């Protein structure tokens, strides 16, 4: 898809990612990484959540939406031309090979 997410050097980048919990309160583990989704987990991980809360975090990369309600959209603050590229958002729907892999294109200028 021709779908891009844009930002000028210095702005915050906003890459979207969503899921709908099977029941209220049942969170699904999610991970974010720089580069397209590999076999499992995230390539060059920047953030990770579990069935409770955020287990791995990195500065600049935050889940500022209601992640508890399935809004796992990412915020990359103060972007550089180095931040340009594909980003993986892996929604780890429980069970045998059920994962929702989202590749998101970020373009810095």
């Amino acid at each position, epitope marked *: 898809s021709e779908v891009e997410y844009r930002a000028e050097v210095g702005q915050n980048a906003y890459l979207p990612c969503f899921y709908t919990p099977a029941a209220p309160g049942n969170l*699904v*583990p999610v*991970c974010w*990484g720089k*580069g*397209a989704c*590999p*076999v*499992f*987990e*995230c*390539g*060059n*991980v920047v953030l*990770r959540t*579990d*069935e409770r809360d955020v*287990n*791995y975090w990195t500065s600049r990369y935050w889940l500022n939406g209601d992640f508890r309600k399935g809004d796992v959209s990412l915020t990359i603050e103060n972007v550089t031309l180095a931040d340009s590229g594909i980003y993986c958002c892996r929604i*780890q*729907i*429980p*069970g*045998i*090979m*059920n*994962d929702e892999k989202f590749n998101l294109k970020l373009v810095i200028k």
Partner: antibody
Amino acid sequence: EVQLVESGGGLVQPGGSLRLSCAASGFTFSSYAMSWVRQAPGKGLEWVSAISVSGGSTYYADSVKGRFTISRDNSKNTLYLQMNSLRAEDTAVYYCAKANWGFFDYWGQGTLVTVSS
Amino acid sequence: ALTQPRSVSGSPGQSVTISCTGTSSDVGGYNYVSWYQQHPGKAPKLMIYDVSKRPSGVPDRFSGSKSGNTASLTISGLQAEDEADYYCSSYADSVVFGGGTKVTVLG
């Protein structure tokens, strides 16, 4: 310092069952995906199955899908492989490895699983 | 899905290179290629991951590259030690391994 110790291999009758364990030390097991990679004697490497960091999502090779079940106990820093409905083709050295996002940096000295009548 | 030469041989000090041919969905449109070294009664050793990334403890003389669908491990200045089996791996959609390559140090 990083150590992985496979246990549970031996001789199983075809159609039988076997449970492999892997004791992890030297790293934060709780924050890495894990997998099992097998090697038939004098043959090459074949990925068997993997488990997410949380343990909630599992991934399998078509050859073992339905028969094998990977599980983790982050509290005991242990990885398990439950092998059911075994066949001669499954005769291999089963390595337990630290899968990251598809690559295996640390491996244990594997356990031999022999499936013969 | 991944094809490697059965054997590559070189004299000590030679630059030698193992190819790994996959599809545009394996090695092509992804940077997810690893390389493992395996000596006789030992478990494999991660030599290169993410096409070129080299783990700590792997000598500088092991370099990883990719062109199109053909990933290449190049062992610059061969040593006797380097006599091992080498497997390439792709981990974009699933974990696949090449057939392996027996590196023979001739001298």
